[PDB]
Amino acid sequence: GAALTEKTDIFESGRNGKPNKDGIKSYRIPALLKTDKGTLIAGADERRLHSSDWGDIGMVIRRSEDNGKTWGDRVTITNLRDNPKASDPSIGSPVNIDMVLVQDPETKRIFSIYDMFPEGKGIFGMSSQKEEAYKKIDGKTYQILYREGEKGAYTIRENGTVYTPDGKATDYRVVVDPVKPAYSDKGDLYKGNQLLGNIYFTTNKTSPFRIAKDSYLWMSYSDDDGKTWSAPQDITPMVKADWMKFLGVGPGTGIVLRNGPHKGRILIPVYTTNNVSHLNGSQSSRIIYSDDHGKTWHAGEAVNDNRQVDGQKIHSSTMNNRRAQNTESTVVQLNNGDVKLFMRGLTGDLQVATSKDGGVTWEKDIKRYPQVKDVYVQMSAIHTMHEGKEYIILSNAGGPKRENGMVHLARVEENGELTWLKHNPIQKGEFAYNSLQELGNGEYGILYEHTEKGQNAYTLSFRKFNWDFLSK
Ligand SMILES: CC(=O)N[C@H]1[C@H]([C@H](O)[C@H](O)CO)OC(C(=O)O)=C[C@@H]1O
Secondary structure, eight states: OOBBBOOOEEEOOOOTOOTTTOOOOEEEEEEEETTTTEEEEEEEEESSSSSSSSSSSSEEEESSSTTTSOOOOOOOEEEEOOTTTOGGGGGGGEEEEEEEEEETTTTTTEEEEEEEOOSSSSGSSSSSSSSOOOEEEETEEEEEEEEOOOOOEEOGGGGEEEEOSSOOEEHHHHSSOOGGGGGTTTEEETTTTTTEEEETTOSSSSSSSEEOSOOOOEEEEESSSSSSSOOOOOOOGTOOTTOSSSSEEEEEEEEEOOTTTTOOOOEEEEEEEETTTTTTOOEEEEEEEESSTTTTTTOOOOOTEEEEETEEEEOOOOOOOOGGGGOEEEEEEEEEOOOOOOOSSSSEEEEEESSSSSSSSOOOEEEEEEEOOOSSSOEEEEEEEETTTEEEEEEESSSSSSEEOOOOOOOOOSSEEEEHHHHEEEEEEOEEEEEEEEEEETTTEHHHHEOOOOOOOOOOOOEEHHHHHOOO
């Protein structure tokens, strides 16, 4: 009655600290998406040198047209070239990290949203002081460029031409429309046809220009079921406020609202930090959305904005409360229009926020569910129906550490509350960061990180199971 398949390594990592046959050491941060054509897209972070949250990392995906039985070749969405002059090769490359997948059910366009950092240690190597990244000139927005020795703000305008702080064009230009595989030529700084450097390089630079050391949010899309992908789109300035230090997505799979006055809206989990307590107490979860099928993006209010904690109000931009944080999350919409946000936190159990206006604002009280343990690791949840009954599946590590992956089943009551029914294990051993997707015909897929036999950091594996496996 109940069946669960053996694990299928989609992105097989190296061993005992060595690279695999392809020269890749580690894989991390999975994302699973079932497309309109029934295809399964497995995304991940290709860490070519080590497992840490920085370095030469590429955004790759694999496709399956047989519900996960077989998988095609690796398809790279983005892979910025590393700095050939960096002193420490482990931290001498622009970074891309933490992918989120989602498809618009009207246009059939598939989106991929991920973080982007210039050369350095990613989120752990952020310049303490702020550097304005964009400038608004007569309506249009341009990315700022800083010149060595100078204080003014150059800008990247039409055709990638660099403009002086006084608004006059220069002989320098940026590669704004890359053409190389994986778009590895993005940010290349030219002076005519002579390549000088890259605006994303921060050390031992060969060119005089660079962008701000900040957190950026990029987006690539595919109009052919994930076969080919667009060049990266910089959506940072559409959603990132000036007070935000870090702005990154909660890895996994987004959703499209299927009912209510905001049907068609796309939701992408993200979380931020302020300049008050950076990652010590400002980690706040929020959501961005697009009401025009991915053309423009907008930022909702954070769950922590105007939240009452221990008799005091707080805001994501000013808080310094370790335990009140909420990071990487996963979003789900109920049949009653409400939106639930399952957030990674530090309370030891599951925290859930609710929204009645499409994820823009959140309710007063954050619900906690001790039945589901949260060991402070990523999680993914999806909505599913069965014989006219509303359910929600959520998966995450069961404990004691990032171990023993679990699959929790909950009933969506008429009032909007959740009743947790069963908790079945899906993988013994190491288990961190997973992504759920419904496959149809009562079948469900899951992509998750796991190691065994001395495998490096995480190998991402895939499994299927049915409703009978879910109901104890
Ligand atoms: C952008 C980034 O670095 N994301 C990382 C995330 C982050 O460090 C933490 O959420 C800070 O709060 O956590 C971890 C982790 O293994 O726990 C992995 C992610 O790759």
